[PDB]
Design a protein around this ligand. Structure first.
Ligand SMILES: [Zn+2]
Ligand SMILES: [Zn+2]
Ligand SMILES: [Zn+2]
Ligand SMILES: [Zn+2]
Ligand SMILES: [Zn+2]
Ligand SMILES: [Zn+2]
Ligand SMILES: [Zn+2]
Length: 197
DNA sequence: CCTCACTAGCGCCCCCTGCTGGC
DNA sequence: GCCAGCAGGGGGCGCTAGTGAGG
């Protein structure tokens, strides 16, 4: 197996060996003229231009969605149609379509928190969770109620706001031990832990 | 072969749940 | 109790860089 030996990639085929030699250290000749980003191959530039125009030739045969590359169509079919989850956890029955999703799941088993907040002692298991946590320090409220124009730090909080304040005839919770009506299920949980041990 | 598949990976934002503490 | 704040385990897509067998 003739190999590059630089990173020691083993290649049974021939043309794939010379193609890998161009990925160790090569410039980016194919330059996009809209933005300032350049690419190595014509196909990478053609796909980049499709993202500029929204051209999606790979159409899903099971739904209306379409994608730029064939890989995005394959991953979509595993999420919404075939439900094929190739990456499985060795500690439980969990499985995911992508590797990083499984690694995020494994960190729930191990408790690894590698993303430390730079302003407090908090650390999260995911990059997004740290960014959502930063709103506590910045006071940012990105989500706005489309009815009363009230702002919230999370989208789920906004949806609960619309349910509890703008939705009519919402089924409320009744305490099984006393005649107390409670709107939110979690507030029923607090009431049960206070006046009922 | 140079085009399309499949893989590997980063990046990003939504979902739902359930608790907390000021009011 | 009402309420927004806030952290937890999750689904799913956007986009790029390599790779693998191919009419
Ligand atoms: Zn190599
Ligand atoms: Zn561009
Ligand atoms: Zn589909
Ligand atoms: Zn697991
Ligand atoms: Zn912090
Ligand atoms: Zn509102
Ligand atoms: Zn009660």
């Amino acid at each position: 197996t003739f190999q590059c030996e630089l990173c020691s990639y083993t290649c049974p085929r021939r043309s794939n060996l010379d193609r890998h030699m161009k990925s160790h250290t090569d410039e980016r000749p194919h330059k996009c003229h809209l933005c300032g980003r350049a690419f190595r191959t014509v196909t990478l530039l053609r796909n980049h231009l499709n993202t500029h125009t929204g051209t999606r030739p790979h159409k899903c045969p099971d739904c209306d969605m379409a994608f730029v590359t064939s890989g995005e169509l394959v991953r979509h079919r595993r999420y919404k149609h075939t439900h094929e989850k190739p990456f499985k956890c060795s500690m439980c029955d969990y499985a995911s379509v992508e590797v990083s999703t499984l690694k995020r799941h494994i960190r729930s088993h191990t408790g690894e928190r590698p993303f430390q907040c730079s302003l407090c002692s908090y650390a999260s298991r995911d990059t997004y969770k740290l960014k959502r946590h930063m709103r506590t320090h910045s006071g940012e409220k990105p989500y706005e109620c489309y009815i009363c124009h009230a702002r919230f730090t999370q989208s789920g909080t906004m949806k609960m706001h619309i349910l509890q304040k703008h939705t009519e005839n919402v089924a409320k919770f009744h305490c099984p031990h006393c005649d107390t009506v409670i709107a939110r299920k979690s507030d029923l949980g607090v009431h049960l832990r206070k006046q009922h041990s």
